[PDB]
Structures are given as C-alpha cells and as structure tokens.
Design a protein around this ligand. Structure first.
Ligand SMILES: Nc1nc2c(ncn2[C@H]2C[C@H](O)[C@@H](COP(=O)(O)OP(=O)(O)OP(=O)(O)O)O2)c(=O)[nH]1
Ligand SMILES: [Cl-]
Ligand SMILES: [Cl-]
Ligand SMILES: [Cl-]
Ligand SMILES: [Cl-]
Ligand SMILES: [Mg+2]
Ligand SMILES: [Mg+2]
Ligand code: NA
Ligand code: NA
Ligand code: NA
Length: 326
DNA sequence: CCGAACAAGCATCAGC
DNA sequence: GCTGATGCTT
DNA sequence: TTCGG
C-alpha cells in the first residue's frame, strides 16, 4: 500500500457520492481512480503524476495535490462534520439499507444503531438480518476459516447429489489472505441453458446446509441466487465464530466459464473487462459473450471452453484470478 | 462539447 | 394475480 | 468524474 492515504481518501469520496449524493457515476469515477492508484507501483509525488493514470482526471488530481500537501481533504473534513451525511453513511453499512432507505430513515429520526434496534418493525426482512449481524458482517474472514467453510460446503453438496459441483469464487478464488464473505458457484448437469430437468436444485442445497446448521439465516432466495448467513461450528467451551455472509449462485452447467469469470471478479475488474468488451464489439454477462451487431444488438452466444476463451475474444492477454483484484 | 459509463437476480411496490 | 419500475445487492 | 470521438 504505497498510496494508501490517497486510495482511502478516494474510497471515502466514492462512498459519499454513492450513499449521500446518490451520484453513481461520481462513485464509479472515484472507485476506478482508487483502483488504478492502488495498482500503481510507485509512491505518488504529485497530482500531475497521478493524472497520467487512466481514470484520474483534473478534479481528482487537484484533490491528490491537496492531500499530499496537507495530509487531509477539506471537502472530507466537512463531510465528516455533517450530521445528515454521517448518519446516512452509517445506516448504509447495514445490509439491505441503501442510500434511499438510509435517507428516509434519517428523515424519520432513525439515525443510530440504537435507533435501528428500537424500530425493527420498520425494517424489511433483509434489513432486519443485516441489523442482527451488523457487527459480525464488519469482520474479515481469515483464509483458514474460508478453507474450513469450503470443506463443509463442498462435502454437504456432495451428500445431496454427487453430480453437483460447488466452486468457491470471489476474493477467495483470487487468493486473498482474507475475504469479506463466501461466494459459491454451483452447477448440476440437470440445469443447462437448454433445459431444467430437475426442480429445486438450489433449494435442496440450501436446505441441506440449513439442516447441518451451517446456513443460519436467509436474506433473499430464488431459483438461481441465494443470499444468506452462515457460521462455522465451534468446539466445546470455545467462543462462537462470527456469522458470515454467503452467496450461492446456480449457473447453467454449459455456461460455467462465463459464470466463474463473473463470480471471481473483482467487481471493478468485471466492470473494466465488460467495458472493454463493448469497445471491442462484444457484451459479456455471467452466461455468455455475444457479438454486437451493426445496430448494437447482441447476437448469438459465442463458443466458450475456458476462461481464456473469453479473454481471447476481446483481445486481452489472460489474467489469472490472483491478478484480477482491482 | 456530449453521450456513455456492466450486467442482472430477488424483494418490494405501484398500477391495472 | 401480472407487468414494470425501483432499490439493493452480487 | 472521466474519457473518447
Ligand atoms: N459484473 C459485476 N460483478 C460483480 C459486481 N459485484 C460483485 N460482482 C461479482 C464479482 C465479485 O468478485 C463477486 C463476489 O462479490 P463480492 O461482493 O463478494 O466481492 P469479492 O468476493 O470479490 O470480495 P469480498 O467478498 O469483499 O472479499 O461477484 C458488480 O457490481 N458487477
Ligand atoms: Cl453521477
Ligand atoms: Cl481527510
Ligand atoms: Cl461459458
Ligand atoms: Cl445471455
Ligand atoms: Mg466475496
Ligand atoms: Mg466510455
Ligand atoms: Na488520467
Ligand atoms: Na447497506
Ligand atoms: Na459475496
């Protein structure tokens, strides 16, 4: 972290614009600048130097000059003083509360963790579970714990049906020494882009993980996406592990490579790669890469037999998961 | 200057 | 109930 | 807020 002060400043600005201003393109601009600066292998000495990087424009360069000169950004120092902005920023830290709900809660005089707990009945289910585990969801997951969780998920999935394949993606697959949550890609040969020959494929896996008390709560759940909560089992007399966020995504089996590229991320890596695809005349989602026709309408799915096939289509050299942490 | 900025599943609600 | 927009999230 | 054309 050669430039951690600058990237922290830009992330805090990004969060302000998203959570408070509801200015999504400014949020994306700040996040992209922080990402490209985080990757920059020199200690930045001036905003002019930073402006040479893609995604750093005139306004961010000027803020970097102020930060390098003083160690601080007046704009942030005053955002930190603003009660309304601070409360809105705080409330969005609860899973299920976004910028809109946070401003509405603040309008109704719900502005602190204490306020939220007294007004559980004003929360939807997702927000209620986010509040319940607010502390736990702030903690990182050591990779050793991720390995224990992987072993449970993969073995419990196997006991449901040996033809399931569960793959831990996200930051874990990128080799991170700690993760914010656990992301599991799931396939089964009965579910392809051509047909669903068996129902409840995701449900049965969720049910089994609930049965063994690994999954403890549900935030949202459909046919292909589960968003919920899990917990490692602890030993006798030991303090319990924190509850953890878990996402499971059931992807058509013939579309595994697009799905594993999507679910490995990072989120900014996906945005960059998808934006590059568009400039190359392709569109990429978690299912397919398709060419854009003359009118910009997606054509038919292109053949894909590896993650590298997708990189080849858009004329990118292959990048291993560990080099996608943008 | 100005249009584009990734893509989509699930929960919720408004309107019919 | 269905459809479509919106919020929130990955 | 930044970038490409
Ligand atoms: N195309 C796209 N993909 C996303 C987006 N957000 C997340 N993803 C994909 C890439 C992520 O690596 C993956 C898992 O989402 P997470 O929020 O768990 O991030 P990740 O695991 O990378 O880091 P973390 O969990 O915080 O350690 O989902 C997005 O806004 N767009
Ligand atoms: Cl904006
Ligand atoms: Cl500051
Ligand atoms: Cl694929
Ligand atoms: Cl598709
Ligand atoms: Mg993750
Ligand atoms: Mg562009
Ligand atoms: Na630049
Ligand atoms: Na939130
Ligand atoms: Na996740």
């Amino acid at each position: 972290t050669l430039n951690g002060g600058i990237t922290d400043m830009l992330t805090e600005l990004a969060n302000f614009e998203k959570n408070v201003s509801q200015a999504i393109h400014k949020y994306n601009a700040y996040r992209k600048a922080a990402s490209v600066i985080a990757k920059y292998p020199h200690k930045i000495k001036s905003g002019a130097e930073a402006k040479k990087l893609p995604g750093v424009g005139t306004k961010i360069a000027e803020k970097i000059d102020e930060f390098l000169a003083t160690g601080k950004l007046r704009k942030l120092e005053k955002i930190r003083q603003d009660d309304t902005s601070s409360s809105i920023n705080f409330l969005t830290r609860v899973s299920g509360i976004g910028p809109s709900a946070a401003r509405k809660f603040v309008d109704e005089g719900i502005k602190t963790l204490e306020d939220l707990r007294k007004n559980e009945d004003k929360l939807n289910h997702h927000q209620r579970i986010g509040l319940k585990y607010f502390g736990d969801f702030e903690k990182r997951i050591p990779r050793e714990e991720m390995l224990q969780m992987q072993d449970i998920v993969l073995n419990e999935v196997k006991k449901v049906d040996s033809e399931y394949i569960a793959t831990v993606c996200g930051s874990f697959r990128r080799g991170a020494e700690s993760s914010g949550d656990m992301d599991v890609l799931l396939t089964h040969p009965s579910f392809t882009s051509e047909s669903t020959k068996q129902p409840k494929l995701l449900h049965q896996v969720v049910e089994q993980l609930q049965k063994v008390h690994f999954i403890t709560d549900t935030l949202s759940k459909g046919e292909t996406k589960f968003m919920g909560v899990c917990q490692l089992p602890s030993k006798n007399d030991e303090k319990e592990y924190p509850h953890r966020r878990i996402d499971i995504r059931l992807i058509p089996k013939d579309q595994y490579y697009c799905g594993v590229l999507y679910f490995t991320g990072s989120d900014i890596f996906n945005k960059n790669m998808r934006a590059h695809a568009l400039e190359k005349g392709f569109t990429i989602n978690e299912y397919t890469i398709r060419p854009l026709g003359v009118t910009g309408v997606a054509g038919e799915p292109l053949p894909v037999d590896s993650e590298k096939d997708i990189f080849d289509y858009i004329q990118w050299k292959y990048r291993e998961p560990k080099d996608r942490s943008e």
